[PDB]
Design a protein around this ligand. Structure first.
Ligand code: NAP
Ligand code: FOL
Ligand code: NA
Ligand code: NA
Ligand code: NA
Length: 160
């Protein structure tokens, strides 16, 4: 089973100049960590560059046509290879970026989305999905606080 996990601001913005389009939201990072820990994570090369170190407690699989730049993670050259490299696990977590989400969304059976209540500039977007195809099975609204500058809502959707 393939799942996507992403944080989206207004107009589905996820990235700007190969970085996050907002300052860190520690609550969202905790959500991200809790949902990806002990699972394989698939990411695009640009997202690898934006993170810059292996995510601990996870099998890190990087999708790139280019030779790898770090022996601590697994480099693969195709979507099919990325999936194969995860082996026989219950859930593969696809963690972006925009080009990777586009390719895996049609394969996805679950989405873990953080809706970030911010209008910020972006050059990378989460793909358009048809809400009618998905059932919301979880939602939780949070306000901004001293540590998180924007309000946010966690949602989990399952494909009908
Ligand atoms: N808000 C969020 O939830 C979140 C999550 C993830 C990422 N982001 C942001 O999104 C941005 C990155 O997105 P992006 O679309 O520019 O890049 P990306 O999807 O992370 O990486 C794209 C790169 O991955 C490789 N790739 C993708 N598909 C491939 C395939 N089928 N076969 C071989 N290689 C493939 C290619 O690299 P090569 O050129 O090496 O071949 C491609 O240029 C960053 O700003 C990051 O901060 C945000
Ligand atoms: N919900 C969500 N929020 C994100 O910010 C996010 N970001 C990307 C890619 N960007 C990144 C950047 C940094 C870390 C990171 O340093 N994660 C730590 C956080 C642990 C914590 O702060 O509690 C980790 O161990 O997972 C993960 C993804 C992909 N999916 C996302 N999904
Ligand atoms: Na096996
Ligand atoms: Na197998
Ligand atoms: Na429901």
């Amino acid at each position: 089973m393939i799942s996507l996990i992403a944080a989206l601001a207004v107009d589905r913005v996820i990235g700007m100049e190969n970085a996050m389009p907002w300052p860190p939201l520690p609550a969202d990072l905790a959500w991200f960590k809790r949902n990806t820990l002990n699972k394989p994570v698939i990411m695009g090369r640009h997202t690898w560059e934006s993170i810059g170190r292996p995510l601990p407690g996870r099998k890190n699989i990087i999708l790139s046509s280019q030779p790898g730049t770090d022996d601590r993670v697994t480099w693969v050259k195709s979507v099919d290879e990325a999936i194969a490299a995860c082996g026989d696990v219950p859930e593969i977590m696809v963690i972006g970026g925009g080009r990777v989400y586009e390719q895996f969304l049609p394969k996805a059976q679950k989405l873990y989305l953080t809706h970030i209540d911010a209008e910020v500039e972006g050059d990378t977007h989460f793909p358009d999905y048809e809400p009618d195809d998905w059932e919301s099975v979880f939602s939780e609204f949070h306000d901004a606080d001293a540590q998180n500058a924007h309000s946010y809502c966690f949602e989990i959707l399952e494909r009908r």
